[PDB]
Amino acid sequence: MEEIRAWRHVFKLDPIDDERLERLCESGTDAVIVGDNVLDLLARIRRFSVPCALEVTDVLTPGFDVYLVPIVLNSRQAEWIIGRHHEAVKQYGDMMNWDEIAAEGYCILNPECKAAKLTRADTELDVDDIVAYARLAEHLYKLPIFYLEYSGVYGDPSVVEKVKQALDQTQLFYGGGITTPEQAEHMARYADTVVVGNAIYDAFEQALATVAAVK
Amino acid sequence: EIRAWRHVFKLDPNKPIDDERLERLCESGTDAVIVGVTIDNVLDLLARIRRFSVPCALEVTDVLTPGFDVYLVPIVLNSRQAEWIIGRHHEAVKQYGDMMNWDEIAAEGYCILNPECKAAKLTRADTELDVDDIVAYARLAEHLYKLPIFYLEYSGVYGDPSVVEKVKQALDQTQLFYGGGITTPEQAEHMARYADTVVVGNAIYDAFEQALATVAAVK
Ligand SMILES: O=P(O)(O)OC[C@@H](O)CO
Numbered sequence: 001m002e003e004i005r006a007w008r009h010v011f012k013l014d015p016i017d018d019e020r021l022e023r024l025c026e027s028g029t030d031a032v033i034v035g036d037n038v039l040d041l042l043a044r045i046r047r048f049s050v051p052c053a054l055e056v057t058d059v060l061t062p063g064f065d066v067y068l069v070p071i072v073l074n075s076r077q078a079e080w081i082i083g084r085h086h087e088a089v090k091q092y093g094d095m096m097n098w099d100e101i102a103a104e105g106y107c108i109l110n111p112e113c114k115a116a117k118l119t120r121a122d123t124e125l126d127v128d129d130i131v132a133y134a135r136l137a138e139h140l141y142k143l144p145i146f147y148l149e150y151s152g153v154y155g156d157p158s159v160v161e162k163v164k165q166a167l168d169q170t171q172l173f174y175g176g177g178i179t180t181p182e183q184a185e186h187m188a189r190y191a192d193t194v195v196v197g198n199a200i201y202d203a204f205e206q207a208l209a210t211v212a213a214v215k
Numbered sequence: 216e217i218r219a220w221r222h223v224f225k226l227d228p229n230k231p232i233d234d235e236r237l238e239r240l241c242e243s244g245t246d247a248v249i250v251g252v253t254i255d256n257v258l259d260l261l262a263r264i265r266r267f268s269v270p271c272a273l274e275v276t277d278v279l280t281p282g283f284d285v286y287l288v289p290i291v292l293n294s295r296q297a298e299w300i301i302g303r304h305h306e307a308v309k310q311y312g313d314m315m316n317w318d319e320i321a322a323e324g325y326c327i328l329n330p331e332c333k334a335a336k337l338t339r340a341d342t343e344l345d346v347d348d349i350v351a352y353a354r355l356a357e358h359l360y361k362l363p364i365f366y367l368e369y370s371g372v373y374g375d376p377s378v379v380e381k382v383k384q385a386l387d388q389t390q391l392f393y394g395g396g397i398t399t400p401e402q403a404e405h406m407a408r409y410a411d412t413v414v415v416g417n418a419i420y421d422a423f424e425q426a427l428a429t430v431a432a433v434k
């Protein structure tokens with residue numbers, strides 16, 4: 001599934017037993033995102049028909065359908081915007097297949113999550129701020145994805161609505177604290193693509209139910 | 216349609232240029248005139264340029280006035296500071312985003328390679344780069360950020376044509392701009408061999424007759 005525009009629901013993985021992985025991959029979810037050990041999980045996912053993406057956070061493992069490359073737009077440090085990216089392309093640029101690679105314009109909005117701390121993300125943003133990042137991602141930078149990252153916490157659907165209004169061709173991903181079908185549905189009204197991570201490990205039945213709720 | 220630009224002149228709105236020179240400049244056959252302090256001064260120069268049909272772009276390096284055909288927005292790719300990569304841009308779009316026509320806006324992925332120029336000092340640009348570094352920046356602009364323009368900035372000095380050659384090899388859909396130290400037709404011709412678009416600035420004020428001759432050398 002290299003056509004990311006059709007994704008409505010995706011699951012994101014970080015141990016996970018075969019039974020849960022099997023149910024996950026056969027759930028009707030549009031993709032499974034992995035965010036030597038990686039190869040093993042990939043091979044296990046390949047037993048199924050679901051598209052498998054690798055979200056690249058370090059300076060590239062073969063076998064995936066899509067490679068998602070975060071750019072932390074609201075990071076106060078150039079290394080999470082261009083630095084690691086430059087280092088990676090300098091080292092591996094000759095052998096990269098860019099047709100398989102999709103940039104994600106991240107806006108990290110949960111101060112308590114590890115990514116926010118690692119990247120020094122300015123999370124204290126009003127809706128005007130986020131809308132401005134969304135415009136930069138589409139109209140200055142030309143990224144296929146703008147990603148609202150609330151990882152660990154559930155955000156405000158009315159904010160997600162405002163961001164979607166500001167976007168046109170750039171796809172809006174939302175992720176963070178979706179644990180019930182109702183939470184999934186509400187974000188999915190506005191976000192193009194809803195991402196469910198943590199609930200997989202803590203409340204599997206409900207995490208699974210988010211697929212049908214998004215439809 | 217910036218894709219057809221082969222030669223462009225860049226004017227400093229803070230430096231004076233009399234009407235006769237401005238006329239000869241605008242009717243020289245250049246593909247565009249780029250204005251690169253105050254809004255009163257930018258508009259006044261725009262009003263004067265509008266006497267002619269040459270496309271006029273504004274290069275926004277600080278917070279900006281409507282009326283231009285194209286807005287060229289530098290992003291300093293080789294800056295060590297987030298402010299010159301996205302920060303200042305965010306502040307500007309936050310205030311003026313509602314009134315921007317995105318069809319008129321083109322980001323320029325700048326790679327500043329002259330350590331002695333004012334921009335390199337202000338933006339804290341790492342100019343100490345080998346050709347691989349520069350190519351990687353070009354590739355990022357082409358494939359990751361998908362910016363309309365990649366800009367090799369040598370402002371004040373004439374760069375090396377073999378460098379812009381290799382960078383051009385890495386680009387496809389992103390347009391390659393070159394600017395820096397172009398005074399002679401030979402300098403203009405040689406960069407135009409590899410760069411999609413050649414930018415002539417300082418020579419306008421320091422060597423006007425020579426600046427005008429660069430047009431034909433490219434086109
Ligand atoms: O873990 P959760 O909160 O579901 O977040 C999903 C995804 O955005 C995490 O990167």
Ligand SMILES: O=P(O)(O)OC[C@@H](O)CO
Binds near residue numbers: 369372393395415417
């Ligand atoms: O002043 P010169 O060296 O012509 O440079 C042209 C332009 O690239 C300046 O930003």
